[PDB]
């Protein structure tokens, strides 16, 4: 019952961060193989998956510090709440370069996406220009 | 007939740039009001729209120089072809701060989009963690 209060505190911290973000305008997932479901249940396997995934999200929060620079107070609160949750599960139980490489690849995919949008519209506007100048 | 060769040269330059981009992985449009269509045709109004739009795309190419730094030779070719096309239409006939503000707003919308993707998956993984830890 104590874990319920810890996770919801993090969920509300996330809900605040995304609300602060909206006003301006391959991630871990649970699988049957992990044993966190009643069928194929493996508490030792499932607990490692929960800790591992949280450790992976803990560094994505670190790389997103510059994203929430105007509301620094909560950005650290979500990290500390995650760290406290991770420490609790680690006691209850017995790489970052790859995540930074993915996060850099994600941002090129968006910048290339903006690049194609600009160039495709340039192409499309040129087509309309030639069709118009063809008549003059 | 000379304009046809000039615009297609630019279109092929764009086709090369986007092909160089894919291997790694409010813009102007024509409207009836502009008079470039046979109905409502206004050669003086339409020619100003063609020149104006090309001038707007000419600075988006300038802000995209860092996007094509590995193939600099073609990035300058598309700009010079556009400038030659713009100069021809300007002889045939009788702000950038806003475009940079839009281009900066476009990139925040993508970074916020990545930010929400990371935080929403963090939220979703936390939900699965609580549902799993609730059973242990």
């Amino acid at each position: 019952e104590r874990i319920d209060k810890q996770i919801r505190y993090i969920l509300d911290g996330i809900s605040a961060l995304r609300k602060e973000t909206c006003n301006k305008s391959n991630l871990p997932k649970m699988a049957e193989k992990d044993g966190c479901f009643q069928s194929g249940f493996n508490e030792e396997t499932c607990l490692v998956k929960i800790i591992t995934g949280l450790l992976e999200f803990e560094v994505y929060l670190e790389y997103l510090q510059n994203r929430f620079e105007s509301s620094e107070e909560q950005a650290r609160a979500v990290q500390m709440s995650t760290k406290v949750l991770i420490q609790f599960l680690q006691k209850k139980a017995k790489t970052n370069a790859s995540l930074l490489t993915k996060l850099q690849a994600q941002n090129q995919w968006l910048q290339d996406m903006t690049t194609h949008l600009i160039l495709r519209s340039f192409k499309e506007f040129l087509q309309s220009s030639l069709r118009a100048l063809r008549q003059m | 007939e000379r304009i046809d060769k000039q615009i297609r040269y630019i279109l092929d330059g764009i086709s090369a740039l986007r092909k160089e981009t894919c291997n790694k992985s409010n813009l102007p449009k024509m409207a009836e009001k502009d008079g470039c269509f046979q109905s409502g045709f206004n050669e003086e109004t339409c020619l100003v729209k063609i020149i104006t739009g090309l001038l707007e795309f000419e600075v988006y190419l300038e802000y995209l120089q860092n996007r094509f730094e590995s193939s600099e030779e073609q990035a300058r070719a598309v700009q010079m072809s556009t400038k030659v096309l713009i100069q021809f239409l300007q002889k045939k006939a009788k702000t950038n701060a806003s475009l940079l503000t839009k281009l900066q707003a476009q990139n925040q919308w993508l970074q916020d989009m990545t930010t929400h993707l990371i935080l929403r998956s963090f939220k979703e993984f936390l939900q699965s963690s609580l549902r799993a830890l609730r059973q242990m």
Partner: antibody
Amino acid sequence: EVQLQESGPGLVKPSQTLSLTCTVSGGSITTRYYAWSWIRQPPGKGLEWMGVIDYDGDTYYSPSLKSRTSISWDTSKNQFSLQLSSVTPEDTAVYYCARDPDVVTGFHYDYWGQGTQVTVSS
Amino acid sequence: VLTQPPLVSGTPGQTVTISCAGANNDIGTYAYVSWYQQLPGTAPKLLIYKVTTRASGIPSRFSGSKSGNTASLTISGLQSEDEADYYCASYRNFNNAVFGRGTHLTVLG
């Protein structure tokens, strides 16, 4: 007391899009930790769970309906709405909006609307 | 979907059982299995949630059971007023819900 009310046209023609709106009374739709779902019932058939929207605004859809189903909301009116695309007679159903008391730890629905009937026909 | 028998029947005062066969991605995940009662012309009424927990005002004769991937609804002391359509629902990963076809409980005699 939580009350749900469905509103929408009783007739939609084939290939048109189906739009319904659920108005929530007695509670904010942005309150933790509620989820707001749409369930439909073809005549003489079973209940089909379509989608759901969080208190955060996040949407989740059935895989069968994900291509043509959209769920949005208007927090100022305390409403969430449904949009179904390219409707067919297979979409003739009574549509229900229901509340999830805690989206975090369970997908069951305690408070239901009165249901609105939509007939697909030209 | 969730497999559910078409008809179930019984005379007053006797017990009936309604089953809800599921798969590993729905009932097998977290056992978030709910049960609903629906009378004609009205919305479904939540009876049981999380397999066993009864909603407020639901009598004890309605019981929630589960074994394997199959949940069962047990209605003791059948009344003539109990004739309705009974649905089971389950959480489906991820953040999905699925209902059974439903069972019509017919009170005979």
